[PDB]
Design a protein around this ligand. Sequence first.
Ligand SMILES: [Ca+2]
Ligand SMILES: [Ca+2]
Ligand SMILES: [Ca+2]
Ligand SMILES: [Ca+2]
Ligand SMILES: [Zn+2]
Ligand SMILES: [Zn+2]
Ligand SMILES: [Zn+2]
Length: 316
Amino acid sequence: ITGTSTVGVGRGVLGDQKNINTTYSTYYYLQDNTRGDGIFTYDAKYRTTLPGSLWADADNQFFASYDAPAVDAHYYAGVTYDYYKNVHNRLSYDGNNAAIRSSVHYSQGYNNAFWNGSEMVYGDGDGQTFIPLSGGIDVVAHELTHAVTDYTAGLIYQNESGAINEAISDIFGTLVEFYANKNPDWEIGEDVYTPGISGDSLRSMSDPAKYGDPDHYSKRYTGTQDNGGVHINSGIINKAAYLISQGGTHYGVSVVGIGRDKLGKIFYRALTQYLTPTSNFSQLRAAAVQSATDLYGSTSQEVASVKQAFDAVGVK
Ligand SMILES: [Ca+2]
Ligand SMILES: [Ca+2]
Ligand SMILES: [Ca+2]
Ligand SMILES: [Ca+2]
Ligand SMILES: [Zn+2]
Ligand SMILES: [Zn+2]
Ligand SMILES: [Zn+2]
């Protein structure tokens, strides 16, 4: 589809009103041309085939409850893009301005969301555990991150490798949240998770243990589920990142906080320049300091805080 760049507006999954780049031809679509190679949001209509139809809206107004998720998907996908472009000078996830496509209304009561290697697919939640996942920016981002990852270090979803991989998504997903500058925090999925309950999330980067997650190497999961514990063991890298940014005393270890940005930088770079499909925790530590190094000197504070954090999570 070919047409006029327009700017619509609707309200997201959280009632939030916002605008969006559409494209107009007879009807209006969830097609943004401002964004590199463009961003497209599809209707999957509770089907499972993908992606469904390019989202068409009669009036450039998207307020219908059915709309919400498209909006979010669409919108967060661009916010995210801007983030990477702007902050890390990266164009789309492949860095080559590939286009971003999302499908919403996938299946019925589908508590999940993901990147399928080619696109973003969003369940809608069942309304108890979740709500349409695209509602959560950190989610959108976390998932999109995986692609980026895919396009870079090509880490593996199994064990340490997989734990860092997820860590990474949580990290950038979180940077993106701050990036948008609306209800940012160090929690994941706060905004779409368990609708009934307030104050909860999937996981906490600030206090993993709050959710039952590891916050120290020594407590690393070694089981089989969740692929060797990827969504679990991320807890470890998460505290570390968090610490780096924000500082603190973890298990007696004191970290001097250097800020979201720096963190952003460090990571983005270790990931693009130093991680191997198999990097493990230690390997992770090593990359980090090395990139800290490249960015700020062997003697930077940064490098130091980077060491503290890992010293502090029992990753050496
Ligand atoms: Ca409408
Ligand atoms: Ca938040
Ligand atoms: Ca969050
Ligand atoms: Ca909740
Ligand atoms: Zn993930
Ligand atoms: Zn996941
Ligand atoms: Zn602690």
